[PDB]
Amino acid sequence: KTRKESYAIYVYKVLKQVHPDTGISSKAMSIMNSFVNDVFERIAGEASRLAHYNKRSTITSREIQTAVRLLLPGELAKHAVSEGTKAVTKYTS
Amino acid sequence: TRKESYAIYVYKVLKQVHPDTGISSKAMSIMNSFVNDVFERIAGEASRLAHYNKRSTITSREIQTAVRLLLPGELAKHAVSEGTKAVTKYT
Amino acid sequence: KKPHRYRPGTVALREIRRYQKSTELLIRKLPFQRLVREIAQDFKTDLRFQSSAVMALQEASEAYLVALFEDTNLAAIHAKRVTIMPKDIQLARRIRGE
Amino acid sequence: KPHRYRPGTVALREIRRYQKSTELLIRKLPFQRLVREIAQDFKTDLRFQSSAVMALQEASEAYLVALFEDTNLAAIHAKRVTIMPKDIQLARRIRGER
Amino acid sequence: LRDNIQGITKPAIRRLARRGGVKRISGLIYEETRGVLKVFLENVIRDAVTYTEHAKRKTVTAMDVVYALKRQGRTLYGF
Amino acid sequence: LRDNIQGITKPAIRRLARRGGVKRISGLIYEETRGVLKVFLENVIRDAVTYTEHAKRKTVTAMDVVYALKRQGRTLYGF
Amino acid sequence: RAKAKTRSSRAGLQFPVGRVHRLLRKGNYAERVGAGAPVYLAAVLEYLTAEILELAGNAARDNKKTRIIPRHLQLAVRNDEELNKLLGRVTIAQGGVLPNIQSVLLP
Amino acid sequence: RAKAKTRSSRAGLQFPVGRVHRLLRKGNYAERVGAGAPVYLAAVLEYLTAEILELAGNAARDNKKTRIIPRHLQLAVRNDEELNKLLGRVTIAQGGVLPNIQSVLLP
DNA sequence: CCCTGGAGAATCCCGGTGCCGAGGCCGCTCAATTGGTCGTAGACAGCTCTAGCACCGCTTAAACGCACGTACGCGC
């Protein structure tokens, strides 16, 4: 039928890469999909606002970096910056 | 350069209800900030409303739905009636 | 012969422990569903609600009321009390902004 | 003999005076230098505009005034007229801050 | 449909307070909690009504309930 | 710059509570009020720091503080 | 090129319909914006501006002032119930709060 | 053309970079979306997903459970002080709350 | 009146069933991927000039401190 966009399988590969011995129910899967989706609009909304405040038309890697510093607090942010920085350097290389 | 502001439009609204009262610059900045802040809430809600039903356009109903979602009580109904009267006069 | 006669408070604490670690919905389905329909019928008649739509409303209302009750309970010890009051809720809603 | 105002009369007079006057209660420079030392932990080479400190100061006081209103209401809720640090901690917890 | 505000029974309100760690529950709490729940439901469902009316739909879906809860800072996961 | 948390003096905290309708002020309130003021400032100013860093500027503007307060639901009018 | 008559005058409005339409276009909200969307947005903004100024002028007259000051705007917003809930999460500078005292705090 | 290698493997990630880029373009956020923005977005979402799942697995091991249930996700979010502040205004269905008792409420 | 032994009941650990939701497999198809091509936002370089930073008089209302007692927090 109609293909509905979801992160059901992608959370699963994340789960096995950090814990290859446990499973996850569909109700917990939908919550994780909801959690991923809700954070997605918050960062994109912050990045869209950040570009609008600087009169800039594109959303770059720095836009997401500032967005996750504003939303994620403290030590949770600094690993997200560290994980985000290592992703862009690997992608460019 | 030129800076966008709502200073003059609020002034004409002010005389249309009380022509005997003025306004200050600090009150003007708060009034400019109030209209701008509400503008992003209604447009942001209308942008979200269009995204929910896979709508690529924002119409008067998009603004109308955001009004009853944001404004509580009789304030929303008066705003809906004012917008409906303006829409009929415009069209 | 003598009845057990548990004193007030101890079984309530046991009910706290048995329900804080629990997962099932405390409010019954149909009484909450019927309350939704009569509230919606004041706003719009001939309106229907999906089973998962009522389910989504039920968990959100319970968690909001549970979080309100935690603020209601924490105000009681703040007021040197262990029994919640209707005025305790009114203070909680005012501080929360509601 | 001195007039010797009873405890509460002058405090009420300050309540009437400061709730209609929009003068800025915290002084400018003592609040301004507090911003510089707080922002020094994030950026050593940082500057602040005069309106930037002005915007921070009114927002902080209105948050503190709103917090004091919730703190005061908790005191009467707890059969008291004196605000307490535990009343502040209850206010942040109910509001979801701390 | 009348007198459905009593569907939230006294043990049901009691069980909800037990989840919140409430030691003792007064007899006047249940009437106040029902009024608080009625006010909270009257805001979320009305917001969901405008969401449903905007979609030209006659049945309120769970997705509109999520949007109604999200816009007031009470976002719900799992729908 | 050290010991600037004492810049919020005792009458200054007293004037804040009088605006809030507080009749009696405890002696331990000022230390607690300074703590919640430091925590609140450590969030808004840090948010404005990231706004200023992203804007390619070395001076924090009041405009950046406006979005810093707005994103936490504390929008300020009059800048 | 006929006579240039603003859409605000066509709808009986003072707020700029074209400016509201322009910010909707560059605000990155939606791919398309309708004709009545800025008309409805400006009418709601005009009503909110008129209602706030009406209560601010009434508060200014109560204080024997014929100029609107930020204290009057704060008094106008907080006194009116729907404006108080709508702007509950809104900070107003140079406005203060309502001059109310609790019953048990009175002598 | 060349082999259609995915951008997630090129960036060393599991979350789909192309899906994030497509939703950014169709989500009406900006006129353009940069190349590194979906890569940064995927890394942040993956780390947040990994941190929650690892804490949920620890909570599942605490009550000797193999399958992750929504109670485990709620317990993982509230126990972490970083996740608690991030999801303070977030309601989790079928999760309950933290099983704690006040000190004066104990027998 | 407080300390300690025995027993009633709700809760916790454990063996057996199984079942139904979760884990794994097959297409395959539609959205992710590859290459090229421009309009164009953006990084970079030089000017500047308007506002912030640092120090100085001063004076004066704001603030620290001490003496006293009565509204009030707290114990019972």
Numbering used by the authors:
A (entry chain R): 28 to 120
B (entry chain V): 29 to 119
C (entry chain S): 36 to 133
D (entry chain O): 37 to 134
E (entry chain T), F (entry chain P): 22 to 100
G (entry chain U), H (entry chain Q): 11 to 117
Relevant lines from the article:
To understand how these nucleosomal features impact Rpd3S binding to the NCP, we reconstituted an NCP with two extra 20 bp DNA linkers flanking the Widom 601 sequence (187 bp) and an MLA at the lysine-36 position of the H3 histone to mimic a tri-methylated lysine (H3K36MLA). 3D classification of the Rpd3S–NCP187bp/MLA complex results in one overall conformation containing three classes, in which the Rpd3S broadly engages the NCP at the SHL + 2 position with slightly different local positionings. Further local refinement of Rpd3S and NCP density allowed us to obtain high-resolution maps of Rpd3S–NCP187bp/MLA complex with the Rpd3S complex at 2.8–3.1 Å and NCP at 2.6–2.7 Å resolution. We named the 3D classes of Rpd3S–NCP187bp/MLA at the SHL + 2 positions collectively as the H3/H4 deacetylation states of the Rpd3S–NCP complex, and we termed the K9Q-locked class as the H3K9 deacetylation state. Within the H3/H4 deacetylation states, the active site of Rpd3 exhibits positional shifts of approximately 10–15 Å. Notably, weak density from a putatively unmodified histone tail can be observed near the Rpd3 active site in these H3/H4 deacetylation states. In all H3/H4 and the locked H3K9 deacetylation states, Rpd3S binds to SHL + 2 of the NCP via a conserved Sin3 basic surface while the MRGA-PHDA arm binds to the phosphodiester backbone of the exiting DNA linker via Rco1A K320/K321/K328. Overall, our structures suggest that Rpd3S primarily targets H3/H4 histone tails through a concerted mechanism involving the coordinated bindings of the Sin3 basic surface to core nucleosomal DNA at SHL + 2, Eaf3 CHDs to H3K36MLA, and the MRGA-PHDA arm to the exit DNA linker.
The five-subunit Rpd3S complex contains a unique subunit Rco1, three core subunits (Rpd3, Sin3, and Ume1) that are shared between the 12-subunit Rpd3L complex, and an Eaf3 subunit that is also a component of the NuA4 histone acetyltransferase (HAT). Rpd3S utilizes the conserved Sin3 basic surface to bind to the nucleosomal DNA positions at SHL + 2, SHL + 5, and SHL + 7, under the conditions involving different H3K36me3–CHD interactions and DNA linker interactions.
